[PDB]
């Protein structure tokens, strides 16, 4: 589990397109076990690959027809770890749509 370079897709609804941006996120392996003895008072813990610290950066997004350029703010991992996904800021699923997902094309 380490910081990796990925390509995320940023999409402009009005313009019916996405632009691709290279950034840095988390991916890799983390250790987990599955208990064989259950103490209802000592439940299990699992860890996932995810950010420990992140920053925001902005990017200019092309316009079209009747819509001028815009700005978009996005998250950038600065440090990963095997931890708990922070459900305040994170959507903890099995599968998302993927970084470079686009409604068009």
């Amino acid at each position: 589990c380490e910081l990796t370079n990925i390509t995320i897709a940023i999409e402009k609804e009005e313009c019916r397109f996405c632009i691709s941006i290279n950034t840095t996120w988390c991916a890799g392996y983390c250790y987990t076990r599955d208990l064989v003895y259950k103490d209802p008072a000592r439940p299990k813990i699992q860890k996932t690959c995810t950010f420990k610290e992140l920053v925001y950066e902005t990017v200019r997004v092309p316009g079209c027809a009747h819509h001028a350029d815009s700005l978009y703010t996005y998250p950038v991992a600065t440090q990963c770890h095997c931890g708990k996904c922070d459900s305040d800021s994170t959507d903890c699923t099995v599968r998302g749509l993927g970084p470079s997902y686009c409604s068009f094309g």
Partner: protein, 90 residues
């Protein structure tokens, strides 16, 4: 790359194993990852999350519930796989 993290598999539990009759356990490493939530996703959710995480966990695909020594009932795992995590949140 392959820095080291052993693959999810069956192993013997040192604390409940006995010579001639071991009990096995799923432990190891699964793949997971975090990345910016697709704008499209944010539309399916009443509560906005700028980051999305997908994760899988090392768990028992099939098991047997046997009893050992001190009158503890335990699970004897027969198959492992990386599957859904239920205890990794917040």
């Amino acid at each position: 790359d392959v820095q080291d993290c052993p693959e999810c598999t069956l192993q013997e539990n040192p604390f409940f194993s006995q010579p001639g009759a071991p009990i096995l356990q799923c432990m190891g490493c699964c793949f997971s990852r975090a990345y910016p939530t697709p704008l499209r996703s944010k539309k399916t959710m009443l509560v906005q999350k700028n980051v999305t995480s997908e994760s899988t966990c090392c768990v028992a695909k099939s098991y047997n519930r046997v009893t050992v020594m001190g009158g503890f009932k335990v699970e004897n795992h027969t198959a492992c796989h990386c599957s859904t995590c239920y205890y990794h949140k917040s």
